Design a protein around this ligand. Sequence first.
Ligand code: RFX
Ligand code: LEU
Ligand code: NA
Ligand code: NA
Length: 498
Amino acid sequence: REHWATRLGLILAMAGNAVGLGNFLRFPVQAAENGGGAFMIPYIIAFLLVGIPLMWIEWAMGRYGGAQGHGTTPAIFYLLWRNRFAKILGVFGLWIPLVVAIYYVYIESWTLGFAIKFLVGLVPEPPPTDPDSILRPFKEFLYSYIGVPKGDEPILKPSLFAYIVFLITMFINVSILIRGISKGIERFAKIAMPTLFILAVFLVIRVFLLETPNGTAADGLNFLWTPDFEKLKDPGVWIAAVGQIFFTLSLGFGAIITYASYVRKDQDIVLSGLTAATLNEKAEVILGGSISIPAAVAFFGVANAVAIAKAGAFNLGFITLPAIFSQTAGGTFLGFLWFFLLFFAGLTSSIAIMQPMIAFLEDELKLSRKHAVLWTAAIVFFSAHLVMFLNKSLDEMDFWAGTIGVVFFGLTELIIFFWIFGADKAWEEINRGGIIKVPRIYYYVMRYITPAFLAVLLVVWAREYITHWTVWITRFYIIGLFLFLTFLVFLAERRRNH
Ligand SMILES: CNCC[C@@H](Oc1ccc(C(F)(F)F)cc1)c1ccccc1
Ligand SMILES: CC(C)C[C@H](N)C(=O)O
Ligand code: NA
Ligand code: NA
């Protein structure tokens, strides 16, 4: 089995897995919609009671599987629980990252396309201070790129440029993945993470120097880091925070598990796991939180920035921020550095959610790396045409896989590892080879607090929160993908028989 060459390259590959579009795009929008600092308390508690323990569980399950030659959950679940239902439940750890990949790689492709155009200066020109006259050209710029419907039909029409950039983005993902774990993912991470970090720091400094009659960047930081204890009674904030924690740390995606299955059976996962998780949180609360919101607040004030963050999820990052930047000398270039940052952040993450399917084909169906990567790219590429051409298909996939799926799957992998396999075996498996030991309090968190936390959350979700007819096209398609992956698991157990 392939293994990570260096401890550092492992940390950075895992950090790269976690540090992505979620830190710079999803987090600020989530924090601004939910009272800024009112969001941060549940977010921290979620990190301590959900984020940390599940990260340790997923590293453990991964290393455990990999030692027996299996990198994915259909098989790993079966090792921990010798039951046919374990294999079926394990299909979600191929389904979730695959469905997520289908839309995530497309959003990643936008950032590349915007980087190219912002570098070459093919950008909208606002007139030489009326906000709507400055924002609109950048709105139209995004709308033409992705092809937002102009009438009644729920159909998108991406520009020719957007389509070819998607193709290039796929080609780039493939070229990294085809070289494997040490020479591909690890090598790229060593280049990509330092670049990503430097670009983000530069932008944070640049944003910190912004001031208008409407405000400063520091008003954005005060909005984000000032608690509201009255909001702590609102369950919506808690549901939002926990969802962000999952998405941001790549928990419940089978992506951490798979990367961990290339950690040698002896090697530490406790300190490594905690460091990768902590690097992500820095890049999210310090770097990601410091760019978009403070810049929006400076130029528009708090209440306008909140309203912008509620307008959509891509309004802030693809419209508002580059619009703001265009009002400053060297702004088109500053736009380029932002989108380049986003591209590298997306790229290190999307290779993490394509690798589970690659690992399944190699481990269970015995395809070569080349064939496994090429077929995985073909399924993502083909499937992506749904997200590219059907309005709100992205939202449907992001809901079922990226939102509901991950929490369900997190609770499931915890029940399988810590309740069925055995709480004492699991704990032994986590700490085995550890540089540091996991605090004793976390045994009771993992066994009782985390699962009760998530079960209560999911109860309120499917009873107090659960559209156009076209959402059924996407549901149909992704259900079919699940059935298809079930077929492959079936074929894998048959190959093992013969
Ligand atoms: C609860 N979250 C809001 C839904 C939001 O989803 C996403 C938000 C951000 C990302 C990103 F991080 F960019 F990858 C991916 C998906 C979304 C999806 C499609 C359109 C608009 C918003
Ligand atoms: C799907 C995951 C790889 C997403 C990643 N953790 C992010 O925050 O962008
Ligand atoms: Na993240
Ligand atoms: Na990343």
